Amino acid sequence: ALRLLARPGDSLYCRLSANVQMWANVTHIMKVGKNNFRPPPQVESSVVRLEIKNPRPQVDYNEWDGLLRIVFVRKNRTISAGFKSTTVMDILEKNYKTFLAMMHDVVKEKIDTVLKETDLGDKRAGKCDQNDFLRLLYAFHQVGIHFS
Amino acid sequence: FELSDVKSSKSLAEIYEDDYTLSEELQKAHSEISELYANLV
Amino acid sequence: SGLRSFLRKK
Amino acid sequence: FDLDDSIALLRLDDLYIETFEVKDVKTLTGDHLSRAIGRIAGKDGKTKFAIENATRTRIVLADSKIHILGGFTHIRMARESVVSLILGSPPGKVYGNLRTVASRLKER
Amino acid sequence: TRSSVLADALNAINNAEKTGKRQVLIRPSSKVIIKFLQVMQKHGYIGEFEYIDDHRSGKIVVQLNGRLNKCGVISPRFNVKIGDIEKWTANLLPARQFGYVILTTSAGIMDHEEARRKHVSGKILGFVY
Amino acid sequence: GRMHSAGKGISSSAIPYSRNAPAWFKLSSESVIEQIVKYARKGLTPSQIGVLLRDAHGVTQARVITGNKIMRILKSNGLAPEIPEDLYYLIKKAVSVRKHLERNRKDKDAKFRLILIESRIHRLARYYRTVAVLPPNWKYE
Amino acid sequence: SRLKKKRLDKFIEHQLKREERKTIIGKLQDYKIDTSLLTSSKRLGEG
RNA sequence: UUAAUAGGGACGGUCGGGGGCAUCAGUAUUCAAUUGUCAGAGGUGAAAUUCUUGGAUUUAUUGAAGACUAACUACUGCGAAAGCAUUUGCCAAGGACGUUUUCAUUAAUCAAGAACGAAAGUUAGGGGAUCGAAGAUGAUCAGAUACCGUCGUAGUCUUAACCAUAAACUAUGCCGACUAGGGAUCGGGUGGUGUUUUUUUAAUGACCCACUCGGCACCUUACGAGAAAUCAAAGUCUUUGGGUUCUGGGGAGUAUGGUCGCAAGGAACUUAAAGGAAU
Numbered sequence: 001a002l003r004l005l006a007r008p009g010d011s012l013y014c015r016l017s018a019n020v021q022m023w024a025n026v027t028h029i030m031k032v033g034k035n036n037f038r039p040p041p042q043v044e045s046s047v048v049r050l051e052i053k054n055p056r057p058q059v060d061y062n063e064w065d066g067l068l069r070i071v072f073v074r075k076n077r078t079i080s081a082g083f084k085s086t087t088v089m090d091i092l093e094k095n096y097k098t099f100l101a102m103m104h105d106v107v108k109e110k111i112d113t114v115l116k117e118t119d120l121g122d123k124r125a126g127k128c129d130q131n132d133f134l135r136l137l138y139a140f141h142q143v144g145i146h147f148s
Numbered sequence: 149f150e151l152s153d154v155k156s157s158k159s160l161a162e163i164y165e166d167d168y169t170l171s172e173e174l175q176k177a178h179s180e181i182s183e184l185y186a187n188l189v
Numbered sequence: 190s191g192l193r194s195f196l197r198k199k
Numbered sequence: 200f201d202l203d204d205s206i207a208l209l210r211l212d213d214l215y216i217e218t219f220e221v222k223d224v225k226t227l228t229g230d231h232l233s234r235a236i237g238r239i240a241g242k243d244g245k246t247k248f249a250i251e252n253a254t255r256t257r258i259v260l261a262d263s264k265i266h267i268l269g270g271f272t273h274i275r276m277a278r279e280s281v282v283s284l285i286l287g288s289p290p291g292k293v294y295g296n297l298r299t300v301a302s303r304l305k306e307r
Numbered sequence: 308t309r310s311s312v313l314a315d316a317l318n319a320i321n322n323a324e325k326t327g328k329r330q331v332l333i334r335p336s337s338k339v340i341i342k343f344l345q346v347m348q349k350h351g352y353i354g355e356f357e358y359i360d361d362h363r364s365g366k367i368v369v370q371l372n373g374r375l376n377k378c379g380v381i382s383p384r385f386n387v388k389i390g391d392i393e394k395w396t397a398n399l400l401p402a403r404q405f406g407y408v409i410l411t412t413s414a415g416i417m418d419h420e421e422a423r424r425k426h427v428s429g430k431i432l433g434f435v436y
Numbered sequence: 437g438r439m440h441s442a443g444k445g446i447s448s449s450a451i452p453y454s455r456n457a458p459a460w461f462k463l464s465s466e467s468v469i470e471q472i473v474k475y476a477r478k479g480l481t482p483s484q485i486g487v488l489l490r491d492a493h494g495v496t497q498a499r500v501i502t503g504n505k506i507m508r509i510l511k512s513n514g515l516a517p518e519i520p521e522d523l524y525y526l527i528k529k530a531v532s533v534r535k536h537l538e539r540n541r542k543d544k545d546a547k548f549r550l551i552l553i554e555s556r557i558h559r560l561a562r563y564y565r566t567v568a569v570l571p572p573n574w575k576y577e
Numbered sequence: 578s579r580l581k582k583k584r585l586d587k588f589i590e591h592q593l594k595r596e597e598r599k600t601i602i603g604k605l606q607d608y609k610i611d612t613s614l615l616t617s618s619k620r621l622g623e624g
Numbered sequence: 625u626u627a628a629u630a631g632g633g634a635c636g637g638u639c640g641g642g643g644g645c646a647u648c649a650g651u652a653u654u655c656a657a658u659u660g661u662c663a664g665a666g667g668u669g670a671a672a673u674u675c676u677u678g679g680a681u682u683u684a685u686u687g688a689a690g691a692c693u694a695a696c697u698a699c700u701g702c703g704a705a706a707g708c709a710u711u712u713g714c715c716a717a718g719g720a721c722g723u724u725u726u727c728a729u730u731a732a733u734c735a736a737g738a739a740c741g742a743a744a745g746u747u748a749g750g751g752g753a754u755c756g757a758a759g760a761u762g763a764u765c766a767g768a769u770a771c772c773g774u775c776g777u778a779g780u781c782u783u784a785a786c787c788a789u790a791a792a793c794u795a796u797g798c799c800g801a802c803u804a805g806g807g808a809u810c811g812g813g814u815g816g817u818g819u820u821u822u823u824u825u826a827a828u829g830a831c832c833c834a835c836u837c838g839g840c841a842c843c844u845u846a847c848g849a850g851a852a853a854u855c856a857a858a859g860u861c862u863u864u865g866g867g868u869u870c871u872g873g874g875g876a877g878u879a880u881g882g883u884c885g886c887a888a889g890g891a892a893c894u895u896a897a898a899g900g901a902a903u
Binding site: 308309310311313314315318319320321322323324325326327331334335362363364376377379380381382383401433 | 626627628629630731732733799800801802803804847848860861862863865866867
Binding site for chain 8: 437438439440441442443444445446447448449450451452458481482483484485486487488489490491495496497498500505506507520521522523524525526529532533535536537539540541542543544545546547548549550551556559560562563564566567569
């Protein structure tokens with residue numbers, strides 16, 4: 001529940017907390033001690049109120065699932081470094097060929113460009129706020145890369 | 149129901165030997181219980 | 190005691 | 200192994216020896232290694248003697264090397280208990296689990 | 308590091324009388340240690356003692372008859388006036404006249420009653436009782 | 437007792453109690469002195485030279501046999517060191533350590549062992565400045 | 578006083594991020610496509 | 625003037641899994657070539673994804689890659705600590721021992737600052753065998769075997785810089801004296817002795833006993849200390865001075881006119897009820 005409450009830029013911010021925050025607004029409510037529940041659970045417990053934004057944001061659930069996984073492999077590593085991992089370019093490489101139907105070193109350079117103008121690649125994935133990923137999500141869409 | 153926690157005086161051949169060949173001690177209690185009461189009475 | 194007694198025995 | 204325990208091999212035709220080594224279960228070194236060995240033996244050999252009576256085997260704790268003699272299922276019933284102590288389970292808890300397996304042996 | 312050779316000597320003598328030793332060895336030697344020893348000697352706390360000189364700081368050997376109930380050094384060596392002396396005898400001696408407080412005065416290192424006898428005063432070295 | 441180390445070694449030399457020349461010694465004091473200057477002229481130090489005289493000439497102690505310390509004999513004949521012997525080998529010792537570090541920069545202990553050395557040099561250099569044996573403007577490297 | 582203006586500074590910035598959010602989301606709808614053929618980022622861990 | 629069983633440096637033979645740069649070996653893991661055979665191989669408490677009739681697993685001849693030094697391995701060794709186990713060479717460094725060599729107080733404590741600082745983490749290259757946070761997916765049956773299996777990113781290795789945190793422990797400031805016995809071990813030195821050794825190439829060992837320093841430690845005990853656990857220091861004759869730096873004056877439950885920080889946003893109603901259940 002603290003993970004869900006974690007804002008963008010928090011150490012406690014997590015790959016989950018981004019999903020729930022943009023699809024819904026989460027408000028912390030009340031804390032219940034371990035002694036309250038019997039047989040006692042070692043884990044601490046909480047109650048939280050969550051409301052889904054209405055109308056639902058007009059964004060594809062998988063696209064941000066695509067962005068959110070690739071860049072939050074490591075929060076404290078750079079977004080570019082999470083990009084720079086060999087595997088993700090390869091997945092993005094088959095992805096780019098799909099849109100052309102709709103040279104791997106070339107797309108990696110193109111991915112490297114959209115990183116440099118955005119400047120989010122240098123910044124830390126956890127530190128970046130939720131709005132930046134929306135702006136970041138757009139730049140790849142403009143270049144023609146959709147993460148999913 | 150209790151476990152022995154000391155060295156088993158019987159070796160494996162002997163316990164396997166025992167297996168090949170409600171409780172007697174429990175009746176030995178009953179007999180000596182019976183003997184006392186007849187003496188008490 | 191404990192490990193100390195064992196190490197003493199050696 | 201004791202001679203009388205070894206004679207069971209001549210007496211029986213379905214008794215085997217199971218041998219393994221503590222570092223195979225978990226990489227223990229120094230005093231951590233020594234403590235694990237003590238747990239298998241226990242105080243005054245109480246723990247092994249419990250493993251000995253219930254699972255119907257013999258176990259030789261030769262330094263870090265353990266050898267278990269008995270029937271195939273019985274040596275396997277001995278092995279996990281030995282493994283459990285190595286991985287950190289207290290002797291008291293396994294003594295309870297050990298006395299549980301001791302029951303199903305006598306019913307069956 | 309060495310701070311007071313006299314302190315070392317007195318502690319060694321104290322331990323020697325603790326453990327029943329009829330002799331004690333002191334190193335290094337010095338005139339202050341020596342003069343302290345004749346003061347104790349003349350008051351009877353210690354017996355015969357001998358100086359072993361080895362062309363270097365030297366050694367003392369002291370015979371002990373078990374009558375030394377304490378020997379101590381007052382560090383750092385405070386200056387003492389004639390009017391102050393009794394205060395010191397009150398602070399360092401369990402009783403008035405049992406055991407003696409050692410002053411180095413312009414006439415040398417001696418105990419305190421001589422110091423009132425010659426009306427001399429000076430710096431404090433220690434106590435014996 | 438060692439600084440910059442935990443060693444408590446006590447091994448050393450034991451000067452004999454008697455400060456007079458040995459009875460068996462039957463060599464003129466002057467013939468010793470001419471040996472002292474020749475070895476120093478060859479380039480040998482007061483430390484090594486004493487070993488040579490003691491090892492092969494029966495000179496138990498230059499002061500005992502001749503009445504003067506060997507530095508004074510060498511100085512009296514015009515032979516003196518630029519800097520006191522203790523400091524000079526400390527300087528050469530640090531130089532050998534430093535020359536080692538350029539070729540091997542990952543010698544991180546040698547980097548530490550270096551630090552222990554000039555700290556010894558600074559303490560020794562400081563003392564020699566106070567007594568005026570070493571000119572005040574002198575600084576290490 | 579100082580607390581109130583700080584709240585207003587937070588509030589107006591709290592408004593400004595929304596209108597930026599609205600504009601970006603408004604721009605998203607122009608560039609939209611299906612995902613069925615697309616290889617999910619779930620595959621990155623598999624390698 | 626001494627030359628502190630203070631100290632520095634020297635020099636002689638040793639000693640070390642102390643450090644760095646190269647170098648050699650070593651099985652093991654994975655992969656690849658060839659080689660003979662055939663149905664499962666793998667894995668679990670039990671099973672399923674998975675590989676396999678283009679031959680899996682297993683058999684042998686090799687080759688390649690990256691890690692890493694089993695057994696020998698011990699209350700043993702080195703280093704300030706963190707840490708350091710293949711061979712050989714190079715570079716310097718170091719404790720202890722010996723010295724009838726050398727300075728002559730050069731010393732103890734301590735701010736800032738500086739060097740080092742397990743593992744994890746960070747920037748930018750290389751490498752990527754194994755293991756492996758994350759993520760994916762199989763199974764979700766059974767409580768001792770109850771969280772396993774397959775793929776596996778970052779990481780695990782290294783280069784050049786950051787991060788400076790551990791139960792980084794004697795859970796225990798430093799320097800210096802004195803205050804019990806005993807015998808095991810490591811390095812050095814001294815004497816004796818007779819076994820192993822061996823001879824005009826050179827060169828020098830091993831064991832036994834005895835002494836003596838320095839080191840990891842160990843057994844029995846304190847005429848002392850502590851309430852005790854215990855302490856050769858956590859001891860220094862009843863109450864107190866050898867030198868010096870730093871630090872101090874229990875378990876739960878309620879509230880908040882005291883602060884520091886946190887979100888987004890543009891339509892009820894039925895009979896209350898046998899108007900029911902009923903093998």
